[PDB]
Design a protein around this ligand. Structure first.
Ligand SMILES: *Cc1c(COP(=O)(O)O)cnc(C)c1O
Ligand SMILES: *Cc1c(COP(=O)(O)O)cnc(C)c1O
Ligand SMILES: *Cc1c(COP(=O)(O)O)cnc(C)c1O
Ligand SMILES: *Cc1c(COP(=O)(O)O)cnc(C)c1O
Lengths: 244, 246, 245, 245
């Protein structure tokens, strides 16, 4: 017997999935009824599932799900999509996307460096064990900061709770190493190279983070921390959600 | 809109609970209708919930649940119970308990040391972020072992996937630090003192594990790794689940 | 008094060089009497010596040793040269180069990912503290592989025991950071860009080694791990040791 | 062919020993001709050699060397000895011990905390890859510190260049983890338990080194950093080298 808030509760989702965070996921934005970088997301999700010993449902199954989801909210310019894989479980959902105010891309947001660490074994996978990231964001919100930053076991700053951090300093856009290989950040790097900007990767500690931070992710595009450097205005423009 | 395996889904539990493993829990054994260390489990569960910013629904609600569960199994020699807290979630469940073979407590089990780590910030809490522990047990079982052991960031051996490791050498019982403070382990410590055994806590590296390993947990009692020494027979007896056919 | 294998011995070398691995070095290939990338090798040896507080004997001294070594092996199609610097020690040596079976450049070799680590302070320098590299190669050879790969303290795969690893995917060549800045790897990178390929540098975890691996160094040129990707065929040709004639 | 400073040098020592720091070693003190803790030193040298794939030649080969060495000091003053093992290499040596000023065992010495790291794999062994230690000691000596301390990859303080650190705080003697398990430090730990003191191992950061630091090593015995705490006076006296009368 199993009770939820006093009331008997039946089956539905497997225990591993519900009780143990035993899943991998990804989140995409759809714009004009077209998901951004669908292939990249499915290729990553498949890699993550396989690395954690989950069967991947196959692209066709997700494409099928997408046929229904894309029409779920006809009055919204954009959608937030989530694709989630667990043993016995393909969970695909959609909700209206609510863009940040444009003024946040012009004026920038704040970040909070937290003391929370990524998992040494899971940090490179987008998994249901998300508490360290949720906790980091909770800490950040406690100061109205937009994003919280996490560390590895060595004290490097390696990730945001839901965005990938970049640092612009000297003449150079740096991608912080050590965390999730974010799709948005790789596209940003690609676009920055495409514009003749200097792009490099590096492992950073908090004391090395001098210059302008930015945050990339499927939920936000490219979001500057504090007022952006002028050199990156066009790069930010290019990744602004098309949702106004 | 949500689809489960292609078919629409009216989701019963909150998003974060399912998607983020955002929960704390505890698992208890009941013997002949009586829950073991109920006070300690509810104390820990509240402590873990408060540490992780999750609303605790109160002892009474859980004790209400408990009566119902116990009523559903009036004949069961033993039960495994589980109490889980998330935001907007009070989950309480019970199912028949089945013991390990009695010989295991005499002849002992195998462990496998794995390369999986606990989370630096959540290791002390019993949370829904339980994947490393799953992976550790999966590795152990692949290798024909009963339990998989996990490391901290520095390579200390700090936990089992669902049991708490102890080391016994000469006349002292060591509790290995850096993992979950298991309730069973603390009880085992308590009983060992009462036996005229000394008890110390420390951080141990694999090579520091000289002596007899044992495993403590709510689901097993106290289980020796390999045959136990007779200095521990008393302790093994005391914690052996009272759950074999009448 | 010092006994070597029971026999009293007056040390020809200073204790630091011998007991403590206190040296920097480089190994070059000479092809038909001409050293490959001599300028690069000597500039790096100087940089490394100075970085570690070792006095550098000057290029002219090694140039003189080089000629002396060349004179000694007038027939050899290729030579393996080692120039080593320690305090009060210039050591220059040569032996005939032993070319790999030519088919390895077509069929590729195997690598073994090992658990050996490079040193946090010395990974960037080519030093006589070389035991972790030898141990990695030992393990690789015990497992039937050609090269062993080493990690950094953080878990990235950052080096091979005597070659620099490269990863090709999609249409970009990645140089693995964290280990020695090899001369051959830099040359391959420059050549790859000239062939129209994108080149990127990053720290990679073992798990992240998706695509084709290759190995670069003065001892091998550019050697593929398993059969190469088509895109890199011209680079394998360009860097092939000219040592089969 | 090898050239040493332009002059042909004859083989003598194998490449791995010579160029790669591929050795394990231990250093002993002898007082009146008998080496302290000879069995422990030899047992450890054997374990270190085996762990690193180096053939250990047997205790008797070193004992034969020892007899040869002792023959050349009939006077039997204190001796500093070193036993070194590489592949095809057994090196044994002895020279007069140089005692520290007696005053240092009551006054204590200074240490310098360096940024040099130990090697992740080799920190637990006493090997020829000794450059980080050398470098740490050189830094210490620039400011008149007796010893330089080294870190691990996390920033823990895990060893001295040639001595093992201990920390005494409340009434507990701590052995700093992460470096070589010194013979002297284990002996000290044993004697400390016999005095009814508690002894624990701990992994320490620089912040956490509050209390009395001490250094243990086959050369120095037990050597305090700053004046020592009274509880430890008997241990300093037990381990003070018998090389002053
Ligand atoms: C999703 C996520 C990101 C951003 O990745 P994208 O693929 O750009 O959406 C960054 N960090 C963490 C921890 C994430 O979960
Ligand atoms: C539950 C659990 C234990 C055992 O704790 P008890 O309170 O004795 O039941 C040990 N390790 C882990 C990881 C656990 O989840
Ligand atoms: C010498 C060496 C290489 C190869 O470098 P090159 O300069 O290309 O010859 C690669 N890795 C290690 C560890 C080396 O010592
Ligand atoms: C030799 C040594 C010590 C001291 O060891 P003993 O066995 O006590 O002589 C401490 N640290 C390092 C790095 C050493 O090499």
């Amino acid at each position: 017997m199993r009770l939820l808030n006093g009331t008997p509760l039946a089956l539905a989702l497997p225990e591993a999935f519900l009780y143990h965070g035993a899943s991998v996921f990804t989140t995409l934005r759809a714009e004009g009824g077209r998901p951004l970088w669908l292939e990249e997301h499915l290729a990553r999700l498949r890699r993550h599932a396989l690395a954690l010993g989950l069967s991947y449902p196959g692209d066709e199954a997700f494409l099928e799900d997408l046929e229904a989801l894309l029409r779920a909210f006809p009055k919204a310019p954009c959608l937030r999509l989530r694709f989630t894989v667990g043993e016995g479980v393909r969970l695909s959902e959609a909700r209206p996307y609510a863009p940040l105010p444009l003024s946040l891309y012009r004026e920038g947001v704040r970040v909070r460096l937290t003391g929370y660490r990524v998992h040494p074994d899971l940090a490179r996978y987008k998994t249901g064990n998300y508490l360290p990231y949720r906790l980091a964001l909770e800490e950040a919100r406690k100061e109205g900061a937009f994003e919280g930053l996490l560390l590895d076991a060595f004290g490097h700053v390696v990730d945001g709770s839901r965005t990938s951090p970049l640092l612009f300093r000297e003449g150079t856009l740096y991608l912080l190493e050590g965390g999730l290989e974010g799709i948005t950040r790789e596209k940003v790097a690609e676009a920055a190279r495409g514009l003749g900007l200097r792009v490099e990767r590096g492992l950073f500690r908090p004391e090395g983070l001098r210059g302008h931070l930015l945050l990339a992710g499927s939920g936000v595009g490219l979001l500057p921390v504090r007022p952006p450097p002028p050199e990156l205005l066009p790069l930010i423009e290019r990744f602004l959600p098309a949702c106004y």
